[PDB]
Symmetry: D3
């Protein structure tokens, strides 16, 4: 249902690498996944992470109950095998007949990065990249990948909560609220290279549109820096599979000191954000000046929506044209 | 859809008072309630039981997850606070900024009586009143408020089961059937003051429309009184939250003796009334002579539903115009 | 919804006889059954098994919560009695007044055979008959009736699964796959007397349309016959209630030896056939040559569907007209 | 613990035959049974039903997790095979070396009768036999074997419950109590051939000691006989596994008509008999005159207990010596 | 097991009055209860709360599954009736025989007070009274009786927690810890009339030995007073059924404002107190000067233990001899 | 009782390091653990993994419910704090009073190695060391620490299952059985340095007594290594917490490929080893030639158990004295 069609051009994370390896005893998958209400299967065929529609072209069985055979995905029902382009190469019942030309299942751009598996459902605008994680490569940093966490909220609403400042005092009094710096500021926001960028005082955001946040917290550079990377998988209209990867300089402490803390603040948000109805933000919400980030976010998604209808070039401009508001130089 | 629109003009019970006090440790509420598919929140602000739509005007969190602070209801997300008129009176993020005029939520007529909280969603026709309970104030009687009991059944069908005389022999054979009173009488039924009134020998029904039933019983076992006040709340298309208050003259025995008995009668009804399908009674049900109470009630509802269409006064007339069939005065 | 209407003309099994006896302590029933999204009640009235809409004419209660009384079915709410023709013959509340002419509930052809209760919702074409079980009569044979097994898949897909050959190697490797007889044959299929007939080499299939299969196996081991009779009740758009009656001539062994093995092959099919989506076979399924039985079955159903809209005798032609493709005498 | 040792000399039922067949997909078993706090395994070896300690000689694994292999039982751990005499005849790890003389597990008299598997743990007295079911042979009769029902009560208390008369009015008011035959008779009891015999007026009891009851009912309605055969497996100190086989000559009705009614009377007994504490009847129980059957049963058990410590032929006397109290010919 | 024998002379609460009325639809009971490992049944026979051993003298069935008939308790098995002295008065099976003299079940002192039902298992020292609740009678005070709450701890350990001062800072930081008055004092303790008495600054304890606490909190008499009455039922060696009744002057607020708060502080204690092992305080616990109350408590229980062995007069002295430590005059 | 007393002199693993870090959000612990029926608490105080009895010296709360504060473990009840020696260093209630000398809890030898935490309950014989893991430090190998897996089985029987050669054909037929290596060899077994050593062709076992097993495998499938280190922890009379660490040379594949495989092997063992009864192997088990490893191990344990009785040095000798059967050097 096509108010969300523009979302198909972006790269979305569907599972962790370790979720795929855990899925089937072979460690190759297949793993079933759902993205923007599409039912897909992921599997490692050879050296490629391949993503096809989880529906076989023959009698419509789910390839995710199949098995990986060599470099192919084998349907569990009558054993057809599919190659990295989703084409059937073996029909065991008539191995000497021709393979019908329609014996084919849709395939989607599937690439690994940062420890997660990303899928891009519609490549026809050739102008979106996998979101940016600042801490990959940086060898001073230890990187932990938390289990995915699922919310009954939309990627847009989850996004907005992660970049929200006004809510600390009420949802996170014990864990995030700084009573001396109690009231949030207004900050300039830049569009650059498909990302939103803004800073605090020091927290620095690089939000690859639509659903990814890259938050670099430094302790006025004195101590040492901490990076949060949080991206929402729009599973369906009501649901998100949410991924948090975090990196830290100070690696001497326990990973589960941080994992529990993150876990805690997410548990504080979840019941509120899930309560918001209607699940998608209607046009009768009343804002005030602290909501700059949420408004600017919605402004740009609307433009990306309209730009999409106009077509490829319009969308490329909408996404990548810079819109600088601050003094920082690019 | 809006075939139930007329029902919004009546007072409906949403919860017992204890339910609201129990809902949150402050004993002030808030408590969430569903009335005719509407999501509402109920709270004690100062001296008032207040009812609002359970949806914040900022970013649409459920206020039922919030907390009562002072004489206002404070949202869980960013702590906007709403007064007894549903107007925001504090935006914690910009305390030195003026509150938007649209920063308000719908408020509803909300009044406590008999130990229950009543809400009127539409007050425009200004002509409905909270059902009549005969045993309030009468200091000779001991009143008990059972816990709400829920049925997968509509308020109309719950009402028809309660005033039905024909089911005693079959659903309640060992608890309410009188062997040599096995065939039900046809009875005069008057409309007075927006109530149905009729008796049976005694059993004296005073049913404030649409969903309340007040049954006084001058026992053939006592020469002393016993009173059943039952009111169905239509929470949605398929289910009711049902309330039972009963008073008794012979107040010397255990409350639970009668509570257990009522609970058993309802247990005998419940499966059968839930089995009735469609949930709303269609035109092809075939009534008989002994269904006089069923018929008059469907007739009055149908008239009231029509009157609602033709506007305020035609409704006030269909409710309040008297119609006498028996030989009593009023 | 008129897409499945032609199926109402066939006899469908809804329950075993032992199901009807177990369903109520009388052993006469009533038992609630669902067929083609119709809610029905079955009860034993005298010497007849009769079937009615499980919805009482009076106030729409479910007669399946009622009791059998002599030779009628008694609604649990107000006690109306319905005879074998679905006619109300007693109304307790006015046992003298005349019973209305609308005091009837629809009655459906219902007759027991093979230990199953079969229902024909539409009899206006008068050309359909209960499926053919080869092994009734045959006193050389022991007949076990397995308990109904439910799947989340449609009767057609269930059917195509039962008659499939290509799948043995992949979902039944250790239970049905013969490595010698590893690749599937294409074999003549006859239409005779409304049944599909075809044979293997020694497996003889007789398939009373649409959802019944009678398979005779003259195993390559001795002179010891085996018959499997499998038939799918289409209870709604997504689910089947399936029955299996099996007969064997080597009958000195335990029934549970064959029940376990039967159950195991069904356990292997189930997750896969259930996985198939959409539940109903769409036009974009790619067949190969080995799918002959599938494609001929689907083609015959289509003729039966479109014969139905023509009228009575067009259907009877499409169903019963012989169409023989092999050299066998009928 | 030597308080219950005399019971090891009787045949006790441990499972139905259909239990043994259902317990493993071969239908040969093995099935684990518990009797008099002994853990046993039952399996079908060729034409014999054999019973062994469910504890393998080698490393003490449970043979009930094993498989039947030809005419032996195969331990699941290291594959030792035991024959009908409980002797190991194969040791895979050294199939040439001599099998030790201790490579044996205890074997117990085990023979099928009436559709049940019966076990005699001690055969050294050679004077006990499987209880007497009156209705085997009788081709006028249909014999139903109900599924075993478990109670948390001892076999004696189960027994005294079955033969009780005073309780009908209070736990079976609506199912067995006759208000005409309201008060219980005292009736002669004979000991003959190791059974208690007594009759009512038309109920004839034959009770093969200790825990079996054969009750024949020539009802006051016509010439239609009914037999109930009930027997308690003492599985430990606190619990019974009880069996009921029932036969009827009026056999045109459903089995489930009698199974439900049977089950209902047992449902009524169960909570009460289970409530009795201590589970074993202490000396301070106060009888009245109507407890004749109870007191004679308990007295006979005591003689059987103390005859046991004397030795073989003292027991056989106490058990089999006739002791007739009525005027009937044996 | 007889380290706890002295406890049988005290009055113990076993249930609330409303627990007895809820237990059976008659509102008369019977209700089963367990005290110091004794299995008892409570029932209202006439105007008396009667308590007997929950074991019938005939065949050992539990009278708690019976019913109250007139002024008697009727066993559920064979219908014997027991009067307020535990004597059988009716044997329905031989209504014209003599009633055996042993047809009797033990009866125990059973009296209601404060809304609870108290049982005294051993009256032979005639020198213990039901604990003292300061707020009964006082008409300025509203009295609420919370549902009983069960802990896996002993009455002695639960007692000591309720009178503990040192633990606020750690188990109740959010709810009871007063940071300005952070460290506990040492207070003089008096023995008077079987009660311990001590005060704070103002909290005033009157602990009727062994297991009852009566805590009067006044707000330096300025505002208004609040009374907590908490008593532990020593169910068995590991378990307590705990009763809290509380009274307040200020009755204008919700009962469930206090009930939730109490509930909260109990939830804070429960997992700690349950963790203490061994469950009974062994002789190797190390005390410090803040533990005066716990030591003095243990000193007196030991003396009551020894006094009991010496006999009645010794015990009466131990319990009632005054031992004044403060200046207050008696 | 103290037949397992000798086991207290060995180092035993109680938890993985992550288990301790995960146990409480601080990542410092505490974590409760049971070792040989002893209740202990483990925490990271400063630089040390500390193990104490999980029982406060004040009033016996479990310190595992407490929190780590500074370099001490703080009790949940009154907040006594214990240093790395189990001595209380702070009594919050009387900070200006001296701490009692008996205010201390038993402390135990506690050391981290290989990612597990080891405890030695008795250090008096000072002659045991933490088991040997061959693949620590070897930088060519990738080490994985599985989650602890629990078995209702003793450490002795778990060990015997792991070194057993005779069960492959039966418990693991499709996962570890080699068809033409179906009969197990008898092998030389040496005692060195308190370890059993033996090989099989290769498979090289190094089993530090009593419960550790270090198995190196130079594959016949690779010419590269794979290492299994398995150690059972006896938590009580009937159960074990089992640890598996494995290293591999070919580190290029998914950890989960092997994790899933190990988990499947254990799944095949588990039911069978749990079925073994009695839990501790009695003298009447009949061993055969192929049980050489079983026999030598029971022999060495029995000797060690005896040596413990005769004192420190006789034990140190029975553990450490070498005994060579093969032709290798050491
Ligand atoms: S469905 Fe995939 S092979 Fe038939
Ligand atoms: S959503 Fe309610 S205050 Fe922001
Ligand atoms: S609804 Fe069936 S009898 Fe009235
Ligand atoms: S334990 Fe039974 S074969 Fe070894
Ligand atoms: S047990 Fe109480 S009457 Fe028989
Ligand atoms: S019990 Fe641990 S500090 Fe008191
Ligand atoms: Fe947040
Ligand atoms: Fe009713
Ligand atoms: Fe199949
Ligand atoms: Fe009975
Ligand atoms: Fe406390
Ligand atoms: Fe193994």
């Amino acid at each position: 249902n096509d108010e969300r069609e523009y979302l198909r051009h972006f790269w979305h994370p569907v599972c962790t690498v370790t979720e795929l390896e855990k899925a089937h005893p072979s460690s190759l998958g297949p793993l079933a996944v759902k993205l923007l209400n599409e039912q897909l299967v992921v599997a490692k065929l050879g050296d490629e992470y391949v993503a096809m529609r989880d529906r076989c072209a023959h009698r419509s069985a789910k390839l995710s109950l199949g098995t990986v055979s060599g470099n192919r995905l084998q349907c569990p029902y009558h054993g057809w095998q599919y190659d990295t382009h989703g084409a059937c190469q073996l029909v065991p019942a008539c191995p000497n007949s021709p393979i019908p030309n329609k014996a084919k299942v849709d395939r989607f751009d599937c690439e690994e990065r940062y420890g997660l598996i990303w899928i891009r459902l519609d490549s026809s605008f050739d102008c979106t990249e996998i979101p940016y994680f600042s801490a990959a490569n940086d060898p001073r940093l230890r990187i932990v990948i938390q289990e995915p966490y699922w919310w009954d909220a939309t990627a847009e609403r989850r996004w907005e909560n992660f970049t929200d400042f006004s809510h600390f005092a009420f949802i996170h009094p014990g864990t995030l609220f700084d009573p001396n710096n109690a009231e949030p500021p207004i900050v300039p926001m830049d569009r650059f290279n498909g990302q939103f960028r803004f800073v605090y005082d020091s927290f620095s955001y690089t939000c690859s549109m639509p659903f990814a946040i890259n938050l670099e917290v430094s302790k006025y550079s004195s101590s040492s820096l901490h990076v949060l990377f949080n991206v929402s998988c729009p599973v369906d209209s009501h649901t998100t599979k949410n991924f948090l990867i975090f990196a830290r300089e100070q690696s001497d402490d326990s990973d589960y000191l941080h994992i529990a803390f993150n876990d805690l603040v997410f548990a504080e948000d979840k019941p509120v954000i899930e309560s918001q109805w209607p699940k998608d933000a209607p046009a009768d919400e009343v804002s005030v000046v602290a909501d700059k980030v949420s408004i600017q976010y919605r402004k740009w998604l609307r433009e990306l929506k309209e730009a999409h209808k106009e077509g490829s070039q319009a969308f490329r401009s909408a996404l990548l044209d810079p819109v600088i508001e601050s003094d920082r130089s690019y």
